[PDB]
Amino acid sequence: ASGSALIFDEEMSRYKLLWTDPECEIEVPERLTVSYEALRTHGLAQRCKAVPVRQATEQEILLAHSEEYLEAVKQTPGMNVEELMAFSKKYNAVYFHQNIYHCAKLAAGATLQLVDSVMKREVRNGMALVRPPGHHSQRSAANGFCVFNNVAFAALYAKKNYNLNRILIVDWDVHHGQGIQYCFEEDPSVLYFSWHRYEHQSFWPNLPESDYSSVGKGKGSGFNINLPWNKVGMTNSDYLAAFFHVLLPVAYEFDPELVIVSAGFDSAIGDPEGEMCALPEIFAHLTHLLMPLAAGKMCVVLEGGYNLTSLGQSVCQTVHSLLGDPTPRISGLGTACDSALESIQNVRNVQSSYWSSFKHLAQIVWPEPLKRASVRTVVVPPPGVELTLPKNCQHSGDISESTAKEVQRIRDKHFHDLTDQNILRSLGNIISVLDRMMRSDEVCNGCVVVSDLSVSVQCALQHALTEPAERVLVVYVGDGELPVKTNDGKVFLVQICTKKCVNRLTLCLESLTAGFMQALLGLILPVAYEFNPALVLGIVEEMRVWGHMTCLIQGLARGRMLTLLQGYDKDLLELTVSALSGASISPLGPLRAPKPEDVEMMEKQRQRLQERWGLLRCTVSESW
Numbered sequence: 001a002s003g004s005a006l007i008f009d010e011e012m013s014r015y016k017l018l019w020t021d022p023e024c025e026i027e028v029p030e031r032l033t034v035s036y037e038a039l040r041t042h043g044l045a046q047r048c049k050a051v052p053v054r055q056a057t058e059q060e061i062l063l064a065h066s067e068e069y070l071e072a073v074k075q076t077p078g079m080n081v082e083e084l085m086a087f088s089k090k091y092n093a094v095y096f097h098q099n100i101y102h103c104a105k106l107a108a109g110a111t112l113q114l115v116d117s118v119m120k121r122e123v124r125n126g127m128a129l130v131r132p133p134g135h136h137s138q139r140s141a142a143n144g145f146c147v148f149n150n151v152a153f154a155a156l157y158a159k160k161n162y163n164l165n166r167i168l169i170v171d172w173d174v175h176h177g178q179g180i181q182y183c184f185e186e187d188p189s190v191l192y193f194s195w196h197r198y199e200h201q202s203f204w205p206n207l208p209e210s211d212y213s214s215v216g217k218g219k220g221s222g223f224n225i226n227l228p229w230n231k232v233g234m235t236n237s238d239y240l241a242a243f244f245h246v247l248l249p250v251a252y253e254f255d256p257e258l259v260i261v262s263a264g265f266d267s268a269i270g271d272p273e274g275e276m277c278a279l280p281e282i283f284a285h286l287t288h289l290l291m292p293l294a295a296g297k298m299c300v301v302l303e304g305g306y307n308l309t310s311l312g313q314s315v316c317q318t319v320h321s322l323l324g325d326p327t328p329r330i331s332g333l334g335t336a337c338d339s340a341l342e343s344i345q346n347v348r349n350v351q352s353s354y355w356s357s358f359k360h361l362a363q364i365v366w367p368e369p370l371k372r373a374s375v376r377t378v379v380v381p382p383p384g385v386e387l388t389l390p391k392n393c394q395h396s397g398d399i400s401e402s403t404a405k406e407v408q409r410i411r412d413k414h415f416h417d418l419t420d421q422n423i424l425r426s427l428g429n430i431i432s433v434l435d436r437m438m439r440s441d442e443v444c445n446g447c448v449v450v451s452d453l454s455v456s457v458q459c460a461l462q463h464a465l466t467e468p469a470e471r472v473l474v475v476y477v478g479d480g481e482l483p484v485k486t487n488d489g490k491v492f493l494v495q496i497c498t499k500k501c502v503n504r505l506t507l508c509l510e511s512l513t514a515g516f517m518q519a520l521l522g523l524i525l526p527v528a529y530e531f532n533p534a535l536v537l538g539i540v541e542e543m544r545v546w547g548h549m550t551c552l553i554q555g556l557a558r559g560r561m562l563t564l565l566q567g568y569d570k571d572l573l574e575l576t577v578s579a580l581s582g583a584s585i586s587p588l589g590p591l592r593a594p595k596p597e598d599v600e601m602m603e604k605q606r607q608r609l610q611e612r613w614g615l616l617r618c619t620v621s622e623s624w
């Protein structure tokens, strides 16, 4: 399954507010248009399978709503403006239009088209550009610009027609989404995460059940996860701390069969409702950070987002991320704010009785986003080995004259009496691939099989730093000290081994899968995102699903990851190439809680690196 469905129709623009109502003045049709035009201005909609919009059937509408409310809305076509005003007065923060019933059927049917397109493997992912939104809609009431609940429709549709038992809903709209919560607060098969501007219940919808204390009800306890922002101005560090330390852990432990995103973009910088300071680029990484889930099956559904500029920019970033484009580098990442650390700590503590990973011992302008390769991956197997590579993979091996001259200079300088032609050819391949991915912009990621690790890592690291590469993240797997000076600050080392530096991170992890996953989500990825490396250098030597890591690390360094594999293993070579080429990662399965010793090691590593890498902090710092 390959492709990125984009469901949209201009008809959902043929409804608007027909009177003066400041509560709803932000929700304009222009939104939809300025989104699609944006995707058309950057060639994204053109790279998308344009699945058509349909009307949701009455039975499908009754999946999440009562017959009384459906019949009430069914008469909104056929009301004059006075009757429309009187009807809209019956509900909270919503207006009605003669075409809004039709457009709500269209939004629900478009969400259902997205779910059908993804689940039927016609596409891998997809985004729905709908209007009106849905997450505030409830069983018998329109609410917060929502008539029908599109995402609840999607989840129930996947549960019914595709017999799914685990579906993850992620609501990164700046408002709560009481509708989705109410719809699945007791259902354990639908895990609802939602972060929202709360301000200690002073912000709309002003509900006590939008607090971190709402964890579900009965069987669904632990499957409702609210993250309340009790202050505005939440930056990218806050959102990524939320992902790394709340959403992603329970998500990968949950192993959802389908991910559905309430992609409201009022959580972006410049929006007049959220008043947050998250750059649109973040919605790339968020999207990317969820893509390894559900074998990539992600159904992004538009919700809020009312600053037209940031709306278009965040839609563009989301679609770029859906199509597998190189995620944009985020700079200036650090610790989340104290209020964010408080929210994260409270939700982790309250959810710890349900997700044992969270238990703890006793104690307005912004820069425009950059434009987001011809050959995504190049593969250098052992000389004389052929493989069946994906459509975006080249065999490379075009060693030039200047490349061989540089290799001869390196050999005469540092590695005298080394006359093996095979390792020299591999070093030339490394240099060529590095030049092609760190300058030519013709390659994103790459992978080379090498035998001599000691000289190969030296060559690769020093040539990367010789090219324009400010910082480098070396993810090494195995034991033994590698020739890596981890003191100049321009290099971070993450060593997964079996058996005292602030720039290094050693991890000596059956449940090794779960422990490694929890570490990657809560330790490796935060330090990596803060470090902001210009290149990722993967090293393996000598039973490990590292494609998840190989995919999640691709968020860093604009996707530039060079893998070095000691020894030829066709299985692992194929795994690396598939993870680099942007393919769907086979799901890791439902992860149990890691062993206590591994949890102690991870907590010790976090405490050892919190003072430098504040993005590891998932708890308020205590004054000395």
Ligand SMILES: NCc1ccc(C(=O)CS)cc1
Residues within 6 Å of the ligand: 022, 023, 024, 093, 133, 136, 144, 145, 173, 175, 204, 264, 266, 273, 303, 304, 305
């Ligand atoms: N003024 C009230 C209000 C209600 C809903 C919104 C949304 O953004 C729906 S997602 C914003 C403001």
Ligand SMILES: [K+]
Residues within 6 Å of the ligand: 171, 172, 173, 174, 175, 176, 177, 194, 195, 196
């Ligand atoms: K939300």
Ligand SMILES: [K+]
Residues within 6 Å of the ligand: 184, 185, 186, 187, 188, 190, 191, 192, 216, 220, 223, 224
């Ligand atoms: K739930």
Ligand SMILES: [Zn+2]
Residues within 6 Å of the ligand: 173, 174, 175, 264, 266, 303, 304, 305
């Ligand atoms: Zn919203």
